[PDB]
Design a protein around this ligand. Structure first.
Ligand SMILES: [Cl-]
Ligand SMILES: [Cl-]
Lengths: 386, 386
């Protein structure tokens, strides 16, 4: 089984990941490609094994948050295109060209300076560029067709850059009111059409995230960017209730009980602040996960974990490295028992959507703040590896 | 200055760690050693460089959450004693003896099993053990004098273990009500004196955290465990208000503006959910930090950052890798401008403590969930490195 000194770990089910890709591949047009988004350590799931697996099973490109995340995938042996979705400093142009990481860019000046850095070094690859068109996200990208033309001309003139994509991001494709999504789409389409009647041939057009690919597959164009759906999580309850694509959650968080005790002697106080007094024959188990792992301190006296198919409440405050749970009066549990923090156990389930609802956040945050000091184990074809 | 592809980073001021150590050193009895707690990646500050500096400037021993965290320190050359505060599986007894990591234990079965594991391996290293006495934290550790005596006996009868410490943890030493802190101390003393009355000589006795080292320095005994105070952060407003010791915060969290734009064209929506709509002449600056870095999504439309010495509000929802801030109508910013997320800038300051109140949590969680994908830079004698 799993041998740890500190007995907490994550299981990422790569069979779920494969299934999530085939579901998306079969929903969207057959012409359209899939870009798997493995930024932020694969939304907390591990970027290397999820990328490796997604490229095996439907994906042809990868997207990350930064050059460094991209280089980690190159060092793992991955030769697929890697697109950086955020901003990359000019000081990393040489390094991105060296690792063949595709950069997002959306400014004329950035293009020219990037091109000179690369020509002043000669012995270079050409740097691939995707243009980010901002159609309503308000984050990064060009916002007018005149500015976009300025950028495409600077890029087309730059001998050491290469134009391989143009994209936009929908900010509300996960919501039932579609008016803003439809507006983003026709803004984008009108921009691409403006470029076409200049006689500018277009590269790969991509615009859909998980929500837009499920809800508007006709927006798939050349490529979609599969993020949250890849991990078997729906972008929102609304997208989930559309019941168009069946996704299967990939991540489970588990631990083993570190210690069990009956609270016979005084004081029967539990954890910092003594916010929880146990009963004389109440049984308190101590678990080796804490808020420094990403298990929110807000789950103090609120959270549940699965122990032997039953939900047992977190007792007292979450500590940096450990939590106490109440097994009840004369509760049954032994040191070493397997506890499920996120995931399924026997009948019962604590999904990350539930923990995210209970914390007034979204599943995206619950999984991508899972600390890297938690080891990740991958299940593929029933069997565990690392 | 600092050259990053993704222009976010942490600065840890080791000169401030030095000062916090001296401040604590003058405040506690000369007999008592200082054990620096660097568990959870040094409370998010980086375990290695903080430990190296602590041992250089007054700390004699280290404490971590797990054997894995101790091995990281040993791999970096640190030879000081290292105590694991948490529970270590029996499957790591041999590894702990090889790396000379000190474990806490509090069970007879664990002692006997740990001993025979090293026995069956003809081990030359005796495994250092500290006994954890639970006097009201209810987390780990032995709870009665009879059980503790049996544990001491099993330890002493174990030729391959070495008893190097006994300790307890204060549940509420950071609160105005000292009732439980006095009670735990009284229990702890009575147990040690119960042991001494049995012809047992005690090893290093330690019990104080930052709070109790500040508020009850007469509890210093042989050694204190300096955690949050090492990083320049007070355990509570109460302990800060007692104005007994002057701590200097060691962490700042900074970034560089990735893009600046005036929201002249429609739509003027900013970020997911279109929860913020800009004015036609409002300046929106995009920053490369997001919830996956540890910047809570709950700061959406509520947090501030420092630009040119001014607090500017987070605009719209925090996204995984980026936030948007409003520089106001006709605001002044350039791409590349340095922004302070946590810490000091010109006159102003966003302290980790303010961010913690804003999120209904404690500074421990704000700092120890700063993600590892953010590079840590170390300032020692007013000069940076990594
Ligand atoms: Cl964007
Ligand atoms: Cl404890």
């Amino acid at each position: 089984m799993i041998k740890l000194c500190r007995e907490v770990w994550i299981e990422v089910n790569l069979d779920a990941v494969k299934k999530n890709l085939r579901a998306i591949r079969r929903h969207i047009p057959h012409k359209s490609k899939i870009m798997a988004v493995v930024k932020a350590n694969g939304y907390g799931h591990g970027s290397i094994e999820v990328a490796r697996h997604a490229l095996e099973h439907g994906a042809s490109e990868l997207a990350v948050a930064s050059v460094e995340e991209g280089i980690v995938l190159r060092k793992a042996g991955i030769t697929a295109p890697i697109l950086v979705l955020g901003f990359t400093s000019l000081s990393c142009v040489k390094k991105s060209a060296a690792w063949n990481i595709t950069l997002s860019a959306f400014q004329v000046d950035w293009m020219k300076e990037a091109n000179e850095i690369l020509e002043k070094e000669a012995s270079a690859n050409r740097l691939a560029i995707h243009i980010n068109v901002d159609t309503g996200m308000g984050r990064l990208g060009v916002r007018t067709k005149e500015e976009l033309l300025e950028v495409v001309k600077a890029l087309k003139a730059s001998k050491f850059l290469r134009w391989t994509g143009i994209f936009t991001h929908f900010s509300t494709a996960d919501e039932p009111d579609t008016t803003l999504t439809k507006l983003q789409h026709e803004k984008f389409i009108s921009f691409l059409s403006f470029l076409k009647k200049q006689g500018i041939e277009l590269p790969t057009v991509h615009m859909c995230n998980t929500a837009a690919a499920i809800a508007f597959p006709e927006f798939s164009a050349d490529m979609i960017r599969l993020g949250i759906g890849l991990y078997g999580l729906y972008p929102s309850a609304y997208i989930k209730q559309l019941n168009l694509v069946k996704l299967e959650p990939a991540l489970s968080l588990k631990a083993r009980i570190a210690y069990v005790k009956t609270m016979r002697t005084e004081p029967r106080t539990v954890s910092y602040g003594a916010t929880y007094i146990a009963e004389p024959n109440e049984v308190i188990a101590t678990l080796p996960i804490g808020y420094a792992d990403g298990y929110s301190r807000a789950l103090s006296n609120r959270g549940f974990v699965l122990h032997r198919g039953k939900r047992v409440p977190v007792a007292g405050r979450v500590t940096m490295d450990m939590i106490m749970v109440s097994l009840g009066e004369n509760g049954e549990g032994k040191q070493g028992d397997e506890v499920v923090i996120y995931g399924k156990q026997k009948g019962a389930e604590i999904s990350v959507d539930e923990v995210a609802e209970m914390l007034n956040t979204i599943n995206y945050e619950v999984v991508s703040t899972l600390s890297r000091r938690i080891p990740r184990f991958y299940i593929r074809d029933g069997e565990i590896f690392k």
